[PDB]
Amino acid sequence: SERIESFVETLKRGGGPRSSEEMARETLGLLRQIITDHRWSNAGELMELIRREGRRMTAAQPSETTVGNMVRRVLKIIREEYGRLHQLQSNIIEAINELLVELEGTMENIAAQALEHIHSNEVIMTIGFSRTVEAFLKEAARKRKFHVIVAECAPFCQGHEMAVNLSKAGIETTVMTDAAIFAVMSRVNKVIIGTKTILANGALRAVTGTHTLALAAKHHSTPLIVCAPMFKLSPQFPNEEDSFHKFVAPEEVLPFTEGDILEKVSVHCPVFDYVPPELITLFISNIGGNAPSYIYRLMSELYHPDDH
Amino acid sequence: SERIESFVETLKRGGGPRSSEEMARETLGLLRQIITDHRWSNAGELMELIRREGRRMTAAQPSETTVGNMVRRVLKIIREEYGRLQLQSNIIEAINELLVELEGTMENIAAQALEHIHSNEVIMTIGFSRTVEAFLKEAARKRKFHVIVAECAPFCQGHEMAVNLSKAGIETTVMTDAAIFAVMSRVNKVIIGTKTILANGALRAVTGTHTLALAAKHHSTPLIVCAPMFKLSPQFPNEEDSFHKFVAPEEVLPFTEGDILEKVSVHCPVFDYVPPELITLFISNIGGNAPSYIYRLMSELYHPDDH
Ligand SMILES: O=C(COc1ccc(Cl)cc1)N[C@H]1CC[C@H](NC(=O)COc2ccc(Cl)cc2)CC1
């Protein structure tokens, strides 16, 4: 039925399911359902329906790149499925089920490869809460006691919660304000950041302090990993400008109090930022450990030239 | 008497007094004696004698820059002495004052140590110097840091200092010279002692100082070169290849393994060249001056007879 419309409203109003493959489980859900029982013609009328419902879905807040990402991957499974087909619903829904089960284990396998990086007594450093970086760092509690420096930035700040969820289970964290990321980072090694979405050229679109942070990395020459799973490799190299973000209400940065000053003064609030591929020095991923400058072909491994 | 000739032979054969106030106390000695009783004319015949005995003294092994350095400073005290101008009383008295001022370098240059090294801070030095060891020993009434010392420079005279430190102080580890780039990714605050420092701001030091300072201005950690006064040499780096000491290649290849030593060329340099584009502070005997200021400090001491 048209419960997807509710879903089309659900992404419209906001209220995030915290990126935990819930957008992916949902997009797989609705694509499974529209894939299940709909109109049927042989010659990709299903694919045309995927383009229509696709572009209607992408008409949401243009930041949830996972929605269109798994949409396009469903299309590539359709194209290869027909490619071998040269009863298709059985093969398509089965392979989509296999992609679901493969998606069902990202946060474990991307966290197994952790002992091979962090060593004893090694002052790691991140910024901003992320599920994968916390799970990833929790499987390195069967090794020695390092430190963790976490930045408290990007207000409204969703960051501390992580400083709790770590320090009551693990290593000796300290929490620094965002405006002190250059007295620190003279005494550190091995920076990690989680990623909101990563671009085709090799860019990280992340939380609103990622840049200003990576610049310090390629100033003191410390390597920064951006641990990010699959299904977040977005096409469309950074052409569209200023729709790249989320501008939120300036209540979060200035209070509605202090009247009259708020007549003539301009307030800005960006949620994301731009990390170019000239500063990332490894990707830890779900299947391999690929470098920055290789990421290109990995994208060609997944998609098809209908990247629009 | 002509015991200076013995001294002129003493620097000739080698056998260093460590550079620890032997070269300066001696040069002050012989300059005091030649200053004391010699030929006398009013119009700087003493100064001409200082030029003659000076250039004869500088005809030693051209690396002991302290000898000519204190020679030239004696000349500047002569020039200012005549400038204000029984002159022997004033000259020998002021030279005595310069001696007593020279008598306390390694303490006052080591007082200013608590204001730099902090708790839990992995310092790092290459080679061994009296002033860097005394300097680091007065920071043992603060917390337990590490010290990473490189075992460079065959003959590798590096360790004695790791002994003389470890049995009195912090947890030092000793690395070979060929591992100064797996380390120096996990360090801060490098220190090096200086054999002599040039006018432009250069450090002429032990034979691994370069390749180390390059790592400092690659990972951007600051390197202090703690060096007292009297070692500010004029003569910006013009004279080439007399800038060193080439020693016998027995120290790097053994006289054993015959016939290979027919056709193969062995090199052995003792010093190297650190340019002023990489040093990031000087801790000194009177102040704490930066690199790019060092220029006028030299003009504070000498006179344009710098040859
Ligand atoms: O625990 C801390 C303090 O951590 C912070 C300091 C400041 C801030 Cl803002 C946050 C955290 N510092 C330690 C961390 C281990 C290190 N390394 C060692 O203990 C020894 O490591 C070495 C030593 C020598 C070599 Cl060659 C290699 C590693 C010393 C400094």
UniProtKB/Swiss-Prot annotation, chain A:
Matching entries from InterPro entries are given as: eIF2B_beta_subunit, IF-2B-related, IF_2B-like_C, NagB/RpiA_transferase-like
Effect seen on changing residue 130 to F: In VWM2; with ovarian failure
What is the annotated localization of this protein?
Answer: Cytoplasm, Cytosol
Query: Superkingdom of this entry's organism?
Result: Eukaryota
Q: Name one GO molecular function term.
A: translation initiation factor activity
A Pfam family that this protein carries is IF-2B
Gene Ontology cellular component list: cytoplasm; cytosol; eukaryotic translation initiation factor 2B complex
Oligomeric state and partners? Component of the translation initiation factor 2B (eIF2B) complex which is a heterodecamer of two sets of five different subunits: alpha, beta, gamma, delta and epsilon. Subunits alpha, beta and delta comprise a regulatory subcomplex and subunits epsilon and gamma comprise a catalytic subcomplex. Within the complex, the hexameric regulatory complex resides at the center, with the two heterodimeric catalytic subcomplexes bound on opposite sides.
What is the protein's given name?
A: Translation initiation factor eIF2B subunit beta
| Source organism (scientific name) | Homo sapiens (Human)
